[model samples]
Target: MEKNFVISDPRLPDNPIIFASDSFLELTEYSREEILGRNCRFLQGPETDQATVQKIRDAIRDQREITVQLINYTKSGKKFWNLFHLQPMRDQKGELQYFIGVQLDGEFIPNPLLGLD
Candidate 1:
């Protein structure tokens, strides 16, 4: 019973995805084994903008927020785009726990991907 999201542990060796929902599985065409224990960059391909990639990492390192849309790929070499809204999470004590992200996986096109501020 989860939504279209993933939770990752930044404290881990490479910010591996700790949890992924069934919605993620269906969208990315990856089984639980492949997505878990892996960084999100596996979705990158030749066309994926490197700077865009770094933006998300910067969000993780800075413990910041980003709602950017960029070109992404699917499991079988198909091309697509996603609106990744990544955020920092914390416990009741205000201690950092991890990060959670949601991707607008469908083709409806929210269209901003704005990263400028």
Candidate 2:
């Protein structure tokens, strides 16, 4: 199942994640206590590629959007390839407000909740 989303605050130190979809908690088997207000790098493991992570850092530093295949870990220490897309959300004044990170299960899994909003 896919459809994991994260909304992080840019004004905060470390740009900690302020919100996370329940689906994301389900996907990673991580509880909200550990995920909320944590950096996205928490998902990365020791073997994870720092170069790609570095690229992602700079990409956001420059306020650009990019997608990359990332090696992420679960609460159980299981590893999986994740298709990660990070996008900057801006307000009317063109000021960056949030960074929206979408995590996909890729070629991915399917699990869209019922929504009509």
Candidate 3:
């Protein structure tokens, strides 16, 4: 499943990205060079909610699992809603190793009342 997931080393500065699926690159419009060793927060944009970001941060700080809905932007500035799930991973020796993040896109439902069309 490594070919289908995003993985990062939490022990590294800014939790630099170590592995990202081709599917992720396609979804984010990012290249392997642009994403590797970079924090995933690069996906956040003006429309991305800070509260949701904080929720993820808190979970990471506590080394716990969390599921959050985030508004992320593609490299081309296209907006997408990501149902993001983050979990801390430990090595076989029980040492903190990596953080696995899975992004699930929700079905788009345009809101005419909010002019989301």
Candidate 4:
């Protein structure tokens, strides 16, 4: 039997958009090409609560991991709950680089779920 796989679109900017594993695109219903050069924030909209956005922003600023359950929109405007896991990256010189976020489809998990606090 041949195994199936999904490859990211090469035309997409590698560094601009957060690198995503093929499974990520499949769950979100977005092509790797479409999400390139776009921050995960694009999933936010007027209906998205403000407090949730702040938690994400704070985590990015503090270079900490943030996992939260929030509503996110699809390219075609369908909404679903996302278990967002964001981690900040650093360069060789220890400077903050782009953040990498992965959205898991499931129930919401709080930021300090693992006794991180």
Which candidate's lDDT is highest? 2
lDDT of 4: 0.64
- TM per candidate comes to 0.85, 0.86, 0.86, 0.69
Quick one: RMSD of model 4?
Answer: 6.7
lDDT of 3 by residue, 1-117 (tens): 423358999888889999999989988889988889998999899988787788899999999999877678889999988878898999899889999999877634333322321
Candidate 1 C-alpha lDDT tens digits along 1-117: 556789999888888999998988887898998789998888779977678788887888789989867777889988778878998999899877889989886535544434342
* Model 4 agreement with the true structure over 58-87: per-residue lDDT tens digits: 776577878777777777787877777766
lDDT-superior candidate, 1 or 2: 2
Model 1 regions lying over 4 Å from their true place: 106-117
Model 2 lDDT per residue over 61-104, tens place:
99899987767999999887788999999999999999999998
Q: How many backbone clashes does candidate 3 have?
A: 0
Q: Candidate 1, residue 55: CA error in Å?
A: 1.7
Error of 4 at 28 (Å): 1.8
lDDT comparison, 2 vs 4, better candidate = 2
Q: Tell me the lDDT of model 1 at 91.
A: 89
